[PDB]
Structures are given as structure tokens and as C-alpha cells.
Write a protein that binds this ligand. Structure first.
Ligand SMILES: [Mg+2]
Ligand SMILES: [Mg+2]
Ligand SMILES: [Mg+2]
Ligand SMILES: [Mg+2]
Ligand SMILES: [Mg+2]
Ligand SMILES: [Mg+2]
Ligand SMILES: [Mg+2]
Ligand SMILES: [Mg+2]
Ligand SMILES: [Mg+2]
Ligand SMILES: [Mg+2]
Ligand SMILES: [Mg+2]
Ligand SMILES: [Mg+2]
Ligand SMILES: [Mg+2]
Lengths: 95, 52, 287, 110, 127
RNA sequence: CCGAGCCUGGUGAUAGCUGGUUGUCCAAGAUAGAAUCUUAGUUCAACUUUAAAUUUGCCCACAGAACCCUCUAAAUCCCCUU
RNA sequence: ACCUCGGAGCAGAACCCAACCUCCGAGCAGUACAUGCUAAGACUUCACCAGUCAAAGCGAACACUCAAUUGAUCCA
């Protein structure tokens, strides 16, 4: 990535990550399963259900995605009707 | 020797499913579940999507 | 203090005497000596050690994780999304109790911001304040409040105590102006008229249930009564209250401030208001 | 910041209670913040180390440490592990006891 | 003082009076309301069904028959909501339950049925 | 010093390759792999280091972990107590 | 000739592990047409990506056989 811009001298976001991932404020990243739109005719209903899921990422994956995005993408957003609003905060988490 | 075809329901319109069919056979008419009308209804083949 | 008594005996504090607080200043490490610098933390010779290690996200040739995942519109129109800062009834009560906001006067965005109860960022696409149901119980305050969004339960809580809640729209420009009036006054430009809600937001602000500012006032009584029936409280009669005039008072649409008409110039230095006289200007500002 | 207005009944609906006049006769005094709240704060470090701090402390802070230990002993069974910062007048406690300590300092008259 | 073309008097000509906006069937006084901190709060609503004049006589009779389980020793109908953090919404659910109860009065089991039928068969003898 | 002259500039070209990388003292510290135009390299895991939180970790005893092929051992996993 | 997947020599007995080699096979097909929807807990080809099993529930009826029988992102 661009650590320092030529114009502003600022860290840049990788726009690929924004197109593919959602960041929850708590630090988790959400993604679609790969190949969920692909060749559904030859796939079992159980497998199709597994594919049609929003899944969280590894610690290592999360750390990668954090570095590849600026602080703007990590801010608390109060969207008017956000389907992922409840998932922004963690409850009853011990260590 | 098999082709993937689209099956469209007569009722609960706008719902369809894909099934494989022998190429040399006639057009399929099936009785399949429709979630829009929440019942089993008749489906007809409209066109062949691909050949597998 | 005992420490000041200690100071009395000690030599005078000078620029010679000073030191940083322990733990504040970590030692700087530099590649000199047996330990810190021979390969200098860089390990054995390779791509990493030469300093030419490939970009973040590159997996050495394998299709990268971030690329492998399909695109989905999680952030499709994040910028064009409207955002509303939540103000709990709990927080509102706290502000009233601590005297940060004045319930005797109408409570607005300016009043909330001046009380520093809420922080509104006009940029970052905040469209104002959302009143939320949190702290509905143990809210005992009679207020005339104007918010951009209000939940059913929050409206019920306000009305139970004999208060009045209204729902208003502020466009980005007027929202900036209303939240920070003093900087705007220093800009020199006359007060603009607040633009009407976008087409999609019009039905919300014209609904009596939401307590919209553009809604029919004749529709308000039965709306209030139905809300009272639902949550099982006797609906207070506002007319009987001596603060009826205060509870009634609302800024009409196309008016940012309570006593200031659009088109007026505030001259703060000499403490005066300048009003246009030209027919064209008056027609423009009134419309 | 405006002075909080006088209420006929305390505590307020929000739960706010003014400091006792005259101040309690104790070796230590805990001063309110600018916003007239008890200065007890939760703290987290390493994402697992949970702490509570009492901040604006004047006088004998060691007296406060002993009293805090005595208060928290029945709740924990064990004596709470604490740090005393004489310089800054701060007392730090391992674990979250923000609500308990706030209530305690309120009843003590701070 | 200032009035625009989008002022409410102009928008709605029939509504002009200030009081018009602020002008004013279960009796809440009759009902007894209690709150318990059971996390979701708990609200309990109790009222004497027999002496409840606001409900119609045949409706009382039908409610007593249908909802006999909720009836106390003293004859008080008790209904409870523990579905919400806010006691407001809990009270609302209780009141709605009362409304639905009145309405329904106005206008798993297979196992039990077989057991009862079998009991009847065994009873088939004379003195 | 011509399989494409020389000079200057771009240019501090690029080099997963070669060579080098400068005070003192102490401490912890070694060999499962996967993918890769990939095996002179890199990314993830494994191991290693630090700090923090909390409870178990290791050693283990009875019991327990398949037939088929007609054979098959040293062993291993699991595991209270200690 | 080979590069991907499945089986045997091949870890004699949890798992994993025999490069190179010597052999075999796979790149389908058949029957359903609820091969609907949803959801505890798990397994996992030593990472990731992928892949696998499944209680309960809703709706039906009175989550197929086969060792592999397969292909991410973009884009159209
Ligand atoms: Mg060394
Ligand atoms: Mg040397
Ligand atoms: Mg190296
Ligand atoms: Mg080397
Ligand atoms: Mg170089
Ligand atoms: Mg050593
Ligand atoms: Mg390749
Ligand atoms: Mg190579
Ligand atoms: Mg190399
Ligand atoms: Mg053991
Ligand atoms: Mg694994
Ligand atoms: Mg292998
Ligand atoms: Mg089932």
C-alpha cells in the first residue's frame, strides 16, 4: 500500500478491501464465502446454505485488513437503518 | 448428454429453479414446491441454460 | 501538603535539577555493538534483509486472501447514507439535572450543542440528533425538544411528563450553521433559508405519528391520544400549564434560528441586525 | 461549566447527588470533576487487564488505600491488588469496581 | 414573527388555532400496576374481574372460564410481561393482552384426547 | 573497450544476487508443514521473544480405541492418583 | 511422459508422515423434484481459501447411490 502519498503525505486505503469486507466497530471483519455465486446447480443444499453466509475473519486476517484501511473506515457510524447495527458491540466477552 | 434447463412455475410467478435433463428427451413438466404460494405447483421448461 | 514541607528543605528547583518522569522515556536502540548491530535485527541475507520485501497483502504468488473473496456491497453508498447522533433520554435527563440545558426554554440542536450534550459533525454526514428510548423509565422532565428523528417510546416518554417533542429536518448547510452559529456569523453572509426535506424523507416529516414539523397540526391530538392508550398513561392537558406558550413555540420551516428571519445579517461587533428592504430579496427569502 | 441547580429532593432522576457540606472529616479528600461527577474510571490495557482508578485525591492516599482494601475484601474474598501513585494522587485497583466505588465515595460524602 | 410560504397556517388553512394541536378505553385507575426487577424488567397487572364494571357481564363469565389459570385465590386476574427492558413496553403488552382477551371473549392435545377416550371406555360398567 | 559509438540527463535506474553493516554488559532463544512462473525468494502456520489475564499444564492407572487381508513388533492415543 | 483429484504398496496398533519411483483409476452418471427453509453443537487434508457432519424448529411426507466424478477473484 501507499504509506505516504505524493500529494498529501498520508496513508492510503486499499479500495479492494472496502469492496469486499465490512468492518464492525468492535474490530471484527465480515466477508462472503468464495464461490457462493458459482455453479450452484452442482452443489448440495447444505453446501449452498454454507456459502450463503456472512462469516468473520481470523485475527491475522483482521490485522491485515486493519493495516490496509485508514482510520476513517474504523469510526463509529450511526446509520439510520443499519442491519448490522447490533453487531457493532460485543456482549459478555471474557478475554 | 445432459442439459441444464430453467423451470418456471405457472403459479406464484417469478420463481424458477434449474434442473438437469436428458438432451434427447422431451420438455420437462414437473410438480415442485413454490415458496411464494407456499405449496407444490406445476413447473414448465422455458429454455436451456447450458449443456453439461 | 507534606511534599511542600519537604520542598522547603530541598535545594531550589532549577533547569539543572529537572528530569523526566520514570517510564516516560524509553531508551533509543541503535545498531552499534555486539548485540544490537551486526546483522542489525534484519536476519540472514534475503529479500527481507535487503529491504525489498513485497507489498502488504501479497502472498508470494498465491491469489491473495483479500482478492480471493467476492465483492459485496457492504459499503456501497456509505457516504450518501444519513447518520444521526443518538441522544438517550438518560443523557437528556442528566443534562437537565446538571443545568447544562435549560428546560424552561425550547431545547434545540443549538441548545444541546451549547450544553455540550451532543457533538454533531456536519461533515461525516450527520443529519442531526436521534432521540432514543434508552432511559424512558426514570425520565421525569417537562421539555419542548426538537430532534431530527424520534422513536415511538421516546415520544411517549416526553409526552407523559407533559412535554412536547417535534421532528425537524436540517440540510447539511443549515445543520452546520445551527450547530456553530457564531462561526457562521463571522462569515459575513446573510442567514439562508433551510431547504425542505428530500423527496424520500418528505412522508416521514409530514406524518403526525413521527411528530413531523410539516405534518398537519389537526392530526396531532389523536396521534398523542393513541400513543397514550398504547403505553397506558393519562395524556396531560398542555393548555392548563402556565408554560403553554413555551411548549407551543416552534420555528417554522425555512427558519434556522428562533427569532431570526432568513436574509438577516448579524453584525456582532457593534451588536446590530441588518435586514434587506428590496422587494426581490424579501420575496426570495420569504419563499 | 454552570453550577448544578438546587433540587428539593436528592438524588436527582439521573442519580446525581451533590457533595456533602461541610466536607467529611477524613485524612483524604476526593475532589469532583469539572462536570461534578465522582472521579472513578474504568481502564483497560492489553485487552484483558481491567482496572479502576480513583483520580482526584488530596491528603493521605494510603488511608484511602486501606479503606478501599477493607471495602473490597468481602466482595473478592482476597485483598485487592492496588497501586498507589503519591505523585499524581491516583489509586489504581485491579478489576472493575467502578459502580461500587462510586456509590461508596458518594455515601462517604465526597 | 417570521412566516414563510411553507408555514403551517398556509399549508393547512383549516387549522389555525394554537390549541387545536393540543386539545384532548381501559380505566387505568381501576387496574393495579406493579414492577419487579427480574436483563428484561417485569410488569404485573392485577384487577378484580368479578367487580370490573367496565367489562360486560357475559364477557366476564367467558374470561373467567377461559383464563381461570390466571385468576388468583382472591379472584384477581393477574397478567405479566417480561419481554422488554423498558417497563413501558411491558405495561403496553399487558394492556394489549387485556384488549385481546376481551375481544376473543366477545367473538400435544392428541395424547390427552386418546387418554380421555380410553378412560371413558374403562368407565363403561354399571352398579 | 561496436550483436549496435560516446557524453549528459532521467538516475541515488533496478538487482528475490554478491559483498559490507561501527560502544559495553546481561537474559530468553533451533529444524511440523501448506501455497507459489515455486524450491537462491515470499505469505500463512509451527517454533521462538516480550507484556498482560486467568486456571490448569506436564508426569499419568483401571477402564477404553476393527474387521478384512491370515496374520504383525517396538509402541501410540486416552488418562485419575501422584 | 508428467503437473489437479481418488485408491494400494505405505507407518504393522490414535492422527500425520516414504520425496523420487511401480501400478491403478476420475474429469461422469443414475433416481428424486421439499436435491424446501432455518438452526445448537462439531470435524477439517497439518496455514488461509476451500471442504464435511448434524440435534431441535417451520413447512412437507406417511437434508439420494457412488472413492474421486472438479476451478477462486475479476469480468460478461
Ligand atoms: Mg546472540
Ligand atoms: Mg564486524
Ligand atoms: Mg533469512
Ligand atoms: Mg545467501
Ligand atoms: Mg541497489
Ligand atoms: Mg542464556
Ligand atoms: Mg501461478
Ligand atoms: Mg523462480
Ligand atoms: Mg529466488
Ligand atoms: Mg490428566
Ligand atoms: Mg485446519
Ligand atoms: Mg502433503
Ligand atoms: Mg430434523
Amino acid at each position: 500500500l501507499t504509506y505516504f502519498s505524493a500529494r498529501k503525505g498520508k496513508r492510503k486505503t486499499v479500495k479492494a478491501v472496502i469492496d469486499r469486507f465490512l468492518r464492525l466497530h468492535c474490530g471484527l471483519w465480515v466477508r462472503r464465502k468464495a464461490g457462493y455465486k458459482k455453479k450452484l446447480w452442482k452443489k448440495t443444499p447444505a453446501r449452498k446454505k454454507r456459502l450463503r453466509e456472512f462469516v468473520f475473519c481470523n485475527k491475522t486476517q483482521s490485522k491485515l485488513l486493519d493495516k490496509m484501511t485508514t482510520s476513517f473506515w474504523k469510526r463509529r457510524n450511526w446509520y439510520v437503518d443499519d442491519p448490522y447495527q447490533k453487531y457493532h458491540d460485543r456482549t459478555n466477552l471474557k478475554v | 448428454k445432459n442439459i441444464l434447463v430453467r423451470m418456471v412455475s405457472e403459479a406464484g410467478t417469478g420463481f424458477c429453479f434449474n434442473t438437469k435433463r436428458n438432451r434427447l428427451r422431451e420438455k420437462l413438466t414437473l410438480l415442485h414446491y413454490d415458496p411464494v404460494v407456499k405449496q407444490r405447483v406445476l413447473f414448465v421448461e422455458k429454455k436451456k441454460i447450458r449443456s453439461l | 501538603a507534606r511534599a511542600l514541607d519537604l520542598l522547603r528543605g530541598l535545594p531550589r528547583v532549577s533547569l539543572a535539577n529537572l528530569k523526566p518522569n520514570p517510564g516516560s522515556k524509553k531508551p533509543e536502540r541503535r545498531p552499534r555493538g555486539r548485540r544490537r548491530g551486526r546483522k542489525c535485527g534484519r536476519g540472514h541475507k534475503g529479500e527481507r534483509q535487503r529491504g525489498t520485501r513485497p507489498r502488504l497483502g501479497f502472498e508470494g504468488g498465491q491469489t491473495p486472501f483479500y482478492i480471493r473473496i467476492p465483492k459485496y456491497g457492504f459499503n456501497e453508498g456509505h457516504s450518501f447514507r444519513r447518520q444521526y447522533k443518538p441522544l438517550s433520554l438518560n443523557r437528556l435527563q442528566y443534562l437537565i439535572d446538571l443545568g447544562r440545558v435549560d428546560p424552561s426554554q425550547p431545547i434545540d440542536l443549538t441548545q444541546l450543542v451549547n450544553g455540550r450534550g451532543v457533538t454533531i459533525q456536519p461533515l461525516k454526514r450527520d443529519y442531526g440528533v436521534q432521540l432514543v428510548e434508552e432511559g424512558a423509565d426514570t425520565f421525569t422532565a417537562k421539555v419542548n425538544i426538537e430532534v431530527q428523528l424520534a422513536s415511538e417510546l421516546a415520544i411517549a416518554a416526553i409526552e407523559k411528563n407533559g412535554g412536547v417533542v417535534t421532528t425537524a429536518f436540517y440540510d447539511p448547510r443549515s445543520l452546520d450553521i445551527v450547530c456553530k452559529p457564531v462561526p457562521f456569523f463571522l462569515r459575513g453572509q446573510p442567514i439562508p433559508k433551510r431547504m425542505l426535506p428530500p423527496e424520500e424523507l418528505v412522508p416521514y416529516y409530514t406524518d403526525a405519528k413521527n411528530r413531523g414539523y410539516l405534518a398537519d397540526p389537526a392530526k396531532f391530538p389523536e396521534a398523542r391520544l393513541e400513543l397514550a392508550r398504547k403505553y397506558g398513561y393519562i395524556l396531560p392537558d398542555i393548555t392548563k400549564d402556565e408554560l403553554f406558550k413555551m411548549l407551543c413555540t416552534r420555528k417554522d420551516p425555512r427558519q434556522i434560528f428562533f427569532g431570526l428571519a432568513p436574509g438577516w445579517v448579524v453584525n456582532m461587533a457593534d451588536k446590530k441586525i441588518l435586514k434587506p428592504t428590496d422587494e426581490n430579496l424579501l420575496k426570495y427569502y420569504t419563499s | 461549566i454552570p453550577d448544578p441547580p438546587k433540587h428539593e429532593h436528592y438524588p436527582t432522576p439521573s442519580g446525581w447527588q451533590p457533595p456533602r457540606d461541610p466536607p467529611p472529616n477524613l485524612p483524604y479528600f476526593v475532589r469532583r470533576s469539572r462536570m461534578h461527577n465522582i472521579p472513578v474510571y474504568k481502564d483497560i490495557t492489553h485487552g484483558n487487564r481491567q482496572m479502576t482508578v480513583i483520580r482526584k485525591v488530596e491528603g493521605d492516599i494510603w488511608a484511602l488505600q486501606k479503606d478501599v482494601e477493607d471495602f473490597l475484601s468481602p466482595l473478592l474474598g482476597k485483598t485487592p491488588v492496588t497501586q498507589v501513585n503519591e505523585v499524581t494522587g491516583t489509586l489504581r485497583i485491579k478489576g472493575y469496581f467502578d459502580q461500587e466505588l462510586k456509590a461508596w465515595l458518594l455515601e462517604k460524602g465526597f | 414573527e417570521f412566516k414563510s410560504i411553507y408555514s403551517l397556517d398556509k399549508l393547512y388553512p383549516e387549522s389555525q388555532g394554537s390549541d387545536t394541536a393540543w386539545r384532548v378505553d381501559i380505566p387505568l385507575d381501576r387496574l393495579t400496576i406493579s414492577y419487579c426487577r427480574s436483563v428484561n424488567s417485569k410488569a404485573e397487572v392485577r384487577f378484580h374481574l368479578a367487580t370490573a364494571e367496565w367489562i360486560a357481564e357475559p364477557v366476564r363469565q367467558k374470561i373467567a372460564i377461559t383464563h381461570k389459570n390466571k385468576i388468583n385465590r382472591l379472584g384477581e386476574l393477574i397478567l405479566t410481561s417480561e419481554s422488554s427492558r423498558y417497563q413501558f413496553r411491558n405495561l403496553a403488552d399487558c394492556l394489549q393482552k387485556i384488549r385481546d382477551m376481551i375481544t376473543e371473549a366477545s367473538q400435544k392435545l392428541h395424547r390427552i384426547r386418546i387418554e380421555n377416550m380410553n378412560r371413558e371406555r374403562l368407565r363403561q360398567k354399571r352398579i
